């Protein structure tokens, strides 16, 4: 019959914006600027964003709108020989939800920890502290800061684990937090986009209210301007070296999330003649804008720390979870009205993640709802069963050694898998399906064909951009380690199964059905590379 549609067009933009703007906008982009020549980093970042990042973002949004199905069904119809891409991409989204939500739980665990007059991560004189505790970050490995010890010894209890083999007790206060995450996700994704498209109003918008309050509070502290200098002081020497271009390339690729089945699913509920090209430019921009803003919010407070708290800038200008769960909370602890800044900061971190968890789950629910009507007829049923598997195995990550498990998933779940997956997406649409067929479809939707620029980027720039990332990725491999702990050989290999279990779907499904059509080899390719539309 008729496929449902976003109750309103802002539900779509916030769902896309919510999915694209998450914690990596805060804890990686600013760091990369600070590290790769300040403002100058914007050159290769914008070039990598213009030639590689946004072309891919646009492609998947158009594909999703035009073909009107989740990732499995969609790739089945574009190039039947490569329906495997659809499986590979849904699997990668499956693995990622196994750990991405526990990081939202951390957010909530700190939020429920900030309901107090004296934030616990301030001092070095608690039952969980060592004698080597010190009040703020330093540069000597055996002497952690008061906030590093709280996060490590009270919240995680990671000190009580000897590695991936030794997971230890289950922190039920974390398990409780994780379940609150999956409950929020349920009655948001429960009834489909009718309601999901609504809650993203809060989850995608709340982070801007909090970014605004913290931007002001941060810019008005002593030392604020010094931070912005470390953030943006141009130094074009970096641009000469490939590593900057690789960090640019890699950041733009993961910050936009193209070829993950989420943009595909979200757009598939659009109206056929919607100006998906306008939407690609608007939302992709708001994503990079949000990162630029966040840098001021972060480095304002970073300079404050270096001006009044006596810490070396390079000791607090970190990336990843340490920035938001250790360094920035430590600075909040020292300013007036600390309890307020913490409560809203962790509620921002959670809403920054929920948006994106939503999208990952939807890419699965949609893809499966569109290949298995049994599932589409029993959504509430299916989703309840999905988030229960997520939660049950998620408990592995709430154990004392749980971080060792997370770190493993994080590197492998969507590591090289996703690069290969979308590399085959770019090839499929541009070379098997054909930019002609693709441009023609777009003209039928929005009135006009994509410019020659996009056709070129989809055809040549994107795939070189993509394996430019993968080649320097491989060329810099290192066995999995965390802070003096070396993962056993068996743990490493176990991750390769996770990594390759999705990628293999591509050649497997190809082989599986290439061997299932009749006739000459040439007569079987042509059957397997004739689109579904071209056969109506």
């Amino acid at each position, epitope marked *: 019959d008729e496929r449902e549609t976003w109750s309103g067009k802002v539900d779509f933009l916030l769902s896309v914006i919510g999915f694209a703007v998450d914690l990596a906008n805060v804890w990686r982009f600013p760091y990369l600027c600070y590290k790769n020549g300040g403002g100058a980093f914007l050159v290769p970042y914008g070039i990598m964003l213009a030639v590689g990042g946004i072309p891919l973002f646009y492609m998947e949004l158009a594909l999703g709108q035009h073909n009107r199905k989740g990732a499995i069904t969609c790739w089945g119809r574009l190039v039947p020989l490569f329906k495997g891409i659809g499986y590979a991409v849904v699997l990668i989204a499956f693995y990622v939800d196994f750990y991405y939500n526990v990081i939202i739980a951390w957010s909530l665990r700190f939020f429920f920890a900030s309901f107090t007059n004296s934030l616990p991560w301030t001092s070095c004189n608690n039952i969980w502290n060592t004698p080597n505790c010190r009040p703020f970050e330093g540069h000597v490995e055996g002497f952690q800061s008061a906030a590093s010890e709280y996060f490590n010894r009270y919240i995680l209890e990671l000190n009580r684990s000897e590695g991936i083999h030794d997971l230890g007790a289950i922190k039920w206060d974390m398990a409780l937090c994780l379940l609150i995450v999956y409950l929020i996700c349920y009655f948001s994704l429960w009834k489909g986009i009718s309601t999901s498209g609504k809650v993203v109003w809060f989850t995608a918008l709340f982070p801007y209210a909090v970014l605004l309050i913290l931007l002001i509070r941060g810019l008005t502290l002593p030392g604020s301007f010094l931070g912005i200098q470390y953030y943006l002081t141009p130094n074009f020497s970096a641009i000469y070296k490939a590593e900057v271009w690789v960090d640019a390339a890699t950041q733009v690729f993961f910050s936009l999330g193209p070829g993950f089945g989420v943009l595909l699913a979200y757009a598939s509920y659009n109206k056929y003649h919607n100006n998906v090209y306008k939407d690609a430019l608007l939302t992709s921009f708001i994503n990079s804008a949000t990162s630029f803003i966040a840098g001021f919010v972060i480095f304002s407070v970073l300079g404050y720390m270096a001006h009044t708290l006596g810490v070396r800038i390079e000791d607090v200008a970190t990336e990843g979870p340490g920035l938001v769960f250790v360094v920035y909370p430590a600075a909040i602890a020292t300013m007036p009205a600390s309890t307020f800044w913490a409560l809203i900061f962790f509620m921002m971190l959670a809403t920054l993640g929920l948006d994106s968890s939503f999208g990952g789950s939807e890419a699965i629910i949609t893809a499966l709802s569109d290949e298995f009507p049994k599932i589409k007829r029993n959504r509430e049923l299916f989703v309840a069963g999905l988030f229960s598997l997520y939660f049950v195995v998620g408990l592995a990550s709430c154990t004392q050694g749980g971080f060792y498990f997370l770190h493993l998933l994080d590197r492998y779940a969507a590591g090289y898998s996703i690069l290969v997956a979308v590399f085959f997406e770019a090839i499929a649409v541009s070379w098997i399906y054909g930019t*002609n*067929r693709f*441009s*023609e*479809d777009i*003209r*039928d939707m929005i*009135g*006009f*064909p994509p410019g020659r620029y996009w056709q070129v980027c989809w055809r040549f720039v994107a795939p070189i951009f993509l394996l430019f990332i993968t080649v320097y990725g491989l060329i810099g491999y290192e066995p999995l380690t965390y802070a003096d702990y070396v993962y056993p050989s068996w743990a490493n290999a176990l991750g390769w199964c996770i990594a390759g279990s999705s990628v293999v779907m591509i050649p497997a499904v190809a082989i599986f059905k290439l061997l299932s059509t009749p006739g000459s080899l040439r007569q079987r390719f042509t059957i397997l590379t004739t689109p579904w*539309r*071209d056969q109506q």
Partner: antibody
Amino acid sequence: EVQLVESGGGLVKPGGSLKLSCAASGFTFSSYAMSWVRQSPEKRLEWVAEISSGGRYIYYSDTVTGRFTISRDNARNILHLEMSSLRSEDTAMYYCARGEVRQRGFDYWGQGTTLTVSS
Amino acid sequence: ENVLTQSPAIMSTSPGEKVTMTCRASSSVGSSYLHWYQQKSGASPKLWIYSTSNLASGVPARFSGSGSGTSYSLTISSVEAEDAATYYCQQFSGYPLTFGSGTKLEMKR
């Protein structure tokens, strides 16, 4: 330099059938949707049928849908219109028009070819 | 079907005078999808104004266009004799594509 020439077209009996042709040149015919626009002797312009650049998207006027078949030969660079079950009110001069961008309209037109449907 | 009516049908003007003609659509039309064609006697149409207000290649600056929704208009500031023609509007936002009934612009003498 873009150039469009319609051909075929003449007197046909009611119920008869006839095939019009538009020879394109001076551009990449295959990058551009084409349409047939007719103009009756009372000078009213009526759009008839549109074919996408790669023939995969086709719209018809309701007044001809069923009896007319637009098609393209992107190798020979010819647009065709196959008309059958012709009625007298199909009498008009038939225009071949290039129109790839809906937001830019039909930016090139041919000289036209004249169809008379009388007994 | 989106019906486009034009006024006046025939209209006379003296060279130099200002001429203005209107296009009314049964149903709203996005401004990027409304165009104008000029057709001189015994010749074929030529794209004249696209996307409401842009002049096509070769169209002199004396021509302008404006409008939105269901009311658009074509305006010649100082009309010349080589502007005698019939002007058709056209909407390109919904199938079936439709043309207006035309305005014949004739010369006063």
